Design a protein around this nucleic acid. Structure first.
Ligand SMILES: Nc1ncnc2c1ncn2[C@@H]1O[C@H](COP(=O)(O)OP(=O)(O)NP(=O)(O)O)[C@@H](O)[C@H]1O
Ligand SMILES: Nc1ncnc2c1ncn2[C@@H]1O[C@H](COP(=O)(O)OP(=O)(O)NP(=O)(O)O)[C@@H](O)[C@H]1O
Ligand SMILES: Nc1ncnc2c1ncn2[C@@H]1O[C@H](COP(=O)(O)OP(=O)(O)NP(=O)(O)O)[C@@H](O)[C@H]1O
Ligand SMILES: [Mg+2]
Ligand SMILES: [Mg+2]
Ligand SMILES: [Mg+2]
Ligand SMILES: [Zn+2]
Lengths: 358, 164, 632
DNA sequence: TTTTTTTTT
């Protein structure tokens, strides 16, 4: 076969050392996609997506979901599609599609008489990337609601009655309702999707292209620095037909070290198999924090709410805690994990009003 | 399920499509050739019925035979019954006894059961003018329209029920 | 390098039948159940023996392991040896007596053996399939023989194999030839031909030596009073969902069933099968020849855990609490589902039929465990189907016309509500179904029939099913500013067909949120519900057993309850006139009251309805009504 | 060939 992991004891030693270092989760999140400036919280979310949570199958056969789902909405030219293509490279068992040219039948399963698999069935125990998600029709969107929660596709049409397993993680990108974010309307108005669909995403990120001379100067300097770069052992006229990185001018980050992508692939492959358990301090912190998030009122602080808050977000807290604990190679989930999970979720949940309205 | 029935001799052409019958006969089994060219047989047999008697008599419905067999005494009882002034109410309220009120609808269904005078060209065996009566019921939910349809469906010998 | 000394193997097999035992439950002695079953065959109270190979494996007998391995490795041969040893045991039991004549073949054999009179002659004249008239089947339970449809390959031909699956297709029972008998015209001799496989070729010319030498040219005529037939059935069996590899579609296999194992399955069942994998008579086609079948839908005996409940009584609160104990709260909703799992009585007064079962509609905000409750109900009910609004057509719910491309024929194919007949259909995402798909269930929910008139087909099908449905309100959330009819965007004709309609809100509250978080985090810690009060709860298996017991009762209504029921109906119908935010009320309501009263009498296992049950039905209807006006 | 049905675009 022509169409993946590899290990040696030196690599295992280095995995032990980096896991025993001070802040491995922050190091991996910084090292994820260096040639894109900013987007640090979204990079942390994508690392949590690549690690994943724990499925629970109870004694009576009941199932609780383990996967993590992420949505990006924002202005044009903010690297949404670029991050989707990067995750498509990094993840094994990954499929990419667009909402522009996908039917819901082709996205889940089809009758052709025979039964025919769709993209989310083919990506079972894997990742689906969907671009231009706002361009999909609602008739196709309503076919996803079973898959994103139960992990199943069920069909009952002429001569065919069948279940199909479709346990996978969804990463989606979209543009807002008006083609460009209106600051005079609320984030829910700009997103323009119903609560039953918005509740199924563990994390939602709103990305804005704000005019601000400091940020414009920094972003333009980073882009031109990545464009003027050439490899150290290369002649000027040429054309394309260990642990740390060594040349980092293209990455923009001045002094702090970055891990090699091959080492990232090996580390994520090993850390995926860790199976941590919960503890009492984590349970108490999660239970208090969930009630505080639900009871917080936004008229105090001149902020506005970005997501619905339901009982699924409690499970999102549990999933993010286990995913953070995996990167430490820890057998137990602790307050150190749950605090980082809460900070990421609280970043996602609330957003200050735009400067055009302020 | 469906079953094949074989009629020999004088039983031939004694029944039409649409009729409801009881059959008495012999249950048989026969073999089948693997190829029509050859002597080999399949070891799973086909089954059918050789008929001996068809019966269509059923007392739970208005009878299916143009009323040839009624006795003189019951004809005289019918003629005596026809002289009640209550004859419309007496016949109408006896139809669909479990249904409460709707007396006007019951009288309409009685008119449907009786019908008009037949007016046919006998040289060509064609209807010159329609003598059958058509009825529409239109109303609120939960008012027993489907139940009245079920009563008329079960009463007659030749009836069909379709829906939606 | 082969063993063919059949007498020693017969000695081993007979020693197994003589020496396997189970101690009596009172300690009074020992039962020898296999030889008891042999004597039942000898006195003709039985037709088959089912042998468990694991009992042979774990018996306290020399060479037991070797015998079990030989049976498993060449099962098609050892069936003959088991039949021979059981025949010898039957003759040793019977002695000089005769077994009773029960059918025409028995009469022919008993008459003809003594016509021959008037062991070498017997065994030469008659084939052993005709001399022996019983069946032998094998079973296994050890996990070494568990396989999928996908794994049965060339190493498994001739071996005993066990698997688990779903039945797609099943034929009706047909007569299958086992032994043909022919008689000669001129010399009156008889020819016996045993049949193996799916074909046979009849002989033409008489073989008897006097006829052949005389050149009498006598034809052979076949006779079906002496010939032997057996029940035959064919199935197609599909892989179970847990057996399939990742990102793959299940496979199927053909199964042949004989004799007493026929009519144990119909379409829509999950089965455990033991059988032998064989070819068809250099590339070969294959099938599975079934030895034993078990319905896992089905499987006077009572468990001790059920005996405790049946002695206790007052079980209603515990039964309500035992439905999906991972889900916190919703006690009245669980009581409504408990009543829908049992239902009322069918009534057929003066030819007019009335539906007995109960219909429930759930609605609520997102994230309030509707799908979890429907999944638990689908696991709990014996025969049940699950569908979603998007994944189903109005032909997949009811029944379809199928045009076979091989023959050109038209046929009918039953949908989900036909397959769920006598049971429960769960419909998720009920608000997202199309109107012209949704209107198919109008006949099923009230008349319990499907009637079709298409192409060259005109029939009626039975669909006696309860429907449990789940939906969201009209814009994904309940709106307290809009009316009940605006929040529940369904027509009145469909709304009148549901006996109960419920709403489940999610509203933020600083104590209830913390209590719910504690419950969910405990479930994620330990894999089971908290049970902080240490009260008893019922296992899923014995809850299924108890509901199956409850369905056997038919409690009658006391005529004293008449005024209470009728006055309640009139009082209910006043408000729909004189309210600012009314709902639709029709004469189906009073039948719903009677249904719920009889359902709770069934749950109590009593035979006469009480006014307490009438009051509980009224309390649940009041709760359902009050759910649709929160904070008013 | 022509006809009738149910899923898909
Ligand atoms: N730091 C950066 N921030 C934003 N964009 C960048 C950055 N560096 C490079 N780009 C460029 O900006 C573009 C990223 O947008 P891209 O991912 O192609 O489409 P998009 O973000 O999904 N917008 P759209 O598809 O129209 O909704 C590419 O041309 C990148 O090369
Ligand atoms: N006057 C009545 N007499 C007898 N039964 C009645 C009466 N009114 C209502 N019912 C009962 O109420 C139900 C009426 O169902 P149904 O026969 O479908 O009425 P319908 O007119 O067809 N409503 P729908 O088909 O939904 O438009 C049945 O259970 C009847 O037994
Ligand atoms: N009271 C509760 N107790 C336990 N788990 C709960 C509770 N409420 C919600 N959940 C969890 O919430 C998740 C979503 O459940 P689900 O059954 O899909 O809700 P839903 O009512 O179907 N929402 P929707 O299908 O979009 O209308 C599951 O993981 C449940 O375990
Ligand atoms: Mg893009
Ligand atoms: Mg009706
Ligand atoms: Mg749901
Ligand atoms: Zn002869």
């Amino acid at each position: 076969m022509l169409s993946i992991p590899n290990f040696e004891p030196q690599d295992v030693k280095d995995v032990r050392k980096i896991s025993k270092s001070r802040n491995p989760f922050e190091l991996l999140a910084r090292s994820l996609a260096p040639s894109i400036c900013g987007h640090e919280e979204t990079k942390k979310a994508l690392l949590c997506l690549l690690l994943g949570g724990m499925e629970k199958i109870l004694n009576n056969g009941s199932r609780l979901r383990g996967d993590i789902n992420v949505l990006l909405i924002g202005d044009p030219s903010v690297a949404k599609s670029q991050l989707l293509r990067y995750v498509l490279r990094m993840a094994p068992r990954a499929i990419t599609t667009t909402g522009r040219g996908s039917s819901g039948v082709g996205l889940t399963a089809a009758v052709t008489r025979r039964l025919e698999a769709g993209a989310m069935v083919l990506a079972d125990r894997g990742v689906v990337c969907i671009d231009e998600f706002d361009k999909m029709s609602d008739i196709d969107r309503t076919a996803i609601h079973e898959v994103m929660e139960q992990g199943r596709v069920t069909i009952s049409k002429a001569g065919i009655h069948a279940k199909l397993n479709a346990r996978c993680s969804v990463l989606a990108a979209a543009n807002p309702v008006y083609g460009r974010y209106n600051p005079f309307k609320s984030p829910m108005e700009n997103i323009g999707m119903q609560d039953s669909l918005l509740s199924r995403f563990d994390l939602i990120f709103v990305l804005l292209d704000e005019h601000d001379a400091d940020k414009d100067a920094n972003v333009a300097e980073h882009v031109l620095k990545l464009h003027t770069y050439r490899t150290q052992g290369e002649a000027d006229g040429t054309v394309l037909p260990s642990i740390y990185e060594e040349n980092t001018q293209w990455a923009g980050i001045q002094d702090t070290k970055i891990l090699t992508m091959d080492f990232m692939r090996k580390y994520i492959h090993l850390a995926r198999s860790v199976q941590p358990k919960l503890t009492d301090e984590a349970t108490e912190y999660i239970s208090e924090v969930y009630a505080d998030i639900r009871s917080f009122d936004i008229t105090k602080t001149d902020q506005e709410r970005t997501m619905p808050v339901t009982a699924r977000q409690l499970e999102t807290l549990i999933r993010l805690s286990t995913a953070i604990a995996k990167a430490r190679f820890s057998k137990k989930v602790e307050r150190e994990d749950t605090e980082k999970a809460y900070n990421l979720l609280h970043f996602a949940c609330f957003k200050e009003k735009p400067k055009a309205r302020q | 399920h469906t079953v094949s029935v074989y009629a020999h001799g004088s039983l031939v052409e004694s029944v039409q499509p649409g009729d409801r019958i009881t059959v008495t006969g012999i249950f048989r089994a026969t073999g089948m050739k693997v190829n029509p060219k050859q002597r080999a047989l399949a070891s799973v047999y086909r089954t059918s019925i050789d008929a001996l008697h068809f019966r269509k008599m059923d007392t739970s419905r208005l009878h299916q035979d143009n009323g040839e067999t009624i006795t003189e005494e019951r004809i005289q009882q019918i003629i005596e019954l026809s002289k009640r002034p209550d004859i419309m109410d007496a016949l109408a309220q006896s139809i669909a006894p479990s249904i409460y009120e709707h007396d006007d609808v019951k009288r309409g269904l009685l008119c449907l059961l009786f019908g008009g005078t037949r007016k046919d060209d006998e040289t060509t065996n064609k209807t010159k003018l329609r003598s059958e009566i058509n009825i529409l019921l239109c109303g609120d939910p939960g008012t027993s329209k489907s139940q009245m349809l079920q009563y008329v469906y079960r009463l007659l010998p030749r009836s069909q029920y379709t829906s939606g | 390098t082969y063993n063919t000394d059949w007498a020693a193997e017969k000695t081993k097999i007979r020693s197994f039948f003589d020496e396997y035992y189970v101690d009596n439950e009172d300690g009074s002695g020992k039962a020898f159940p296999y030889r008891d079953q042999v004597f039942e065959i000898a006195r003709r109270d039985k037709q088959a023996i089912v042998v468990n190979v694991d009992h042979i494996k774990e018996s306290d007998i020399p060479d037991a392991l070797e015998l079990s391995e030989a049976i498993t490795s060449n099962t098609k041969r050892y069936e003959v040896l088991f039949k021979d040893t059981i025949s010898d045991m039957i003759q040793d039991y019977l002695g000089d007596k005769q077994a009773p004549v029960i059918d025409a073949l028995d009469a022919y054999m008993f008459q003809r053996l003594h016509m021959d009179r008037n062991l070498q002659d017997k065994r030469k004249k008659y084939p052993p399939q005709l001399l022996q008239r019983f069946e032998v089947y094998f079973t296994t339970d050890d996990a070494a023989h568990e396989t999928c449809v996908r794994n049965i390959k060339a190493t498994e031909i001739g071996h005993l194999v066990s698997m688990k699956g779903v039945v797609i297709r099943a034929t009706e029972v047909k007569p299958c030839v086992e032994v043909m008998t022919y008689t000669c015209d001129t010399c009156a001799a008889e020819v016996y031909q045993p049949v193996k496989g799916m074909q046979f070729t009849p002989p033409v010319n008489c073989p008897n030596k006097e006829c052949v030498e005389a050149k009498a040219n006598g034809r052979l005529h076949m006779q079906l009073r002496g010939s032997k037939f057996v029940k035959f059935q064919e199935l197609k069996i599909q892989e179970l969902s847990e057996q399939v590899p990742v990102g793959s579609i299940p496979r199927t296999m053909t199964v042949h069933v004989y004799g007493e194992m026929t009519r144990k399955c119909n379409t829509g069942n999950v089965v455990h099968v033991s059988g032998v994998f064989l070819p068809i008579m250099l590339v070969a086609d294959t099938y599975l020849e079934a030895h034993y079948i078990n319905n896992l839908d089905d499987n006077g005996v009572q468990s001790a855990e059920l005996e405790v409940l049946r002695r206790k009584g007052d079980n209603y609160e515990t039964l309500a609490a035992s439905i999906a104990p991972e889900i916190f709260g919703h006690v009245d909703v669980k009581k409504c589902l408990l009543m829908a799992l049992v239902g009322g009585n069918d009534n057929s007064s003066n030819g007019m039929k009335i539906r007995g079962c109960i219909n429930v509609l759930m609605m609520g905000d997102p994230g309030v465990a509707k799908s979890q409750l429907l999944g638990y109900v689908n696991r709990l009910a014996p025969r049940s189907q699950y569908t979603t609004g998007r994944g189903s057509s109005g032909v997949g719910l009811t029944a379809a016309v199928m045009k076979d491309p091989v023959t050109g024929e038209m046929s009918l194919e039953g949908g989900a509500l036909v397959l769920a007949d006598g049971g429960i259909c769960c419909i998720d995402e009920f608000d997202k179904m199309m109107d012209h798909d949704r209107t198919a269930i109008h006949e099923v929910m009230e008349q319990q029939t499907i009637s079709i008139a298409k192409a060259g087909i005109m029939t009626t099908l039975n669909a006696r099913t309860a429907i449990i449905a789940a939906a969201n309100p009209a814009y994904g959330r309940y709106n307290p500013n809009r009316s009940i009819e605006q929040n529940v965007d369904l027509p009145a004709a469909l709304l009148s067909r549901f006996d109960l309609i419920l709403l489940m809100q999610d509203k933020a509250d600083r104590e209830n949120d913390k209590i719910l978080a504690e419950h969910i985090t405990y479930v994620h810690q330990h894999g089971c519900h908290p049970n902080r009060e240490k009260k008893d709860l019922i296992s899923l298996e014995t809850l299924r057993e108890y509901i199956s017991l409850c369905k056997t009762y038919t409690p009658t209504v006391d005529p004293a309850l008449r005024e209470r029921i009728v006055e309640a109906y009139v009082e209910m119908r006043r408000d729909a006139r004189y309210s600012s935010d009314p709902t639709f009320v029709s004469p189906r309501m009073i039948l719903g009251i009677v249904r719920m009263a009889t359902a709770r009498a069934k749950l109590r296992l009593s035979t006469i309805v009480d006014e307490s049950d009438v009051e509980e039905a009224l309390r649940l209807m009041q709760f359902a009504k009050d759910s649709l006006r929160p904070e008013q």
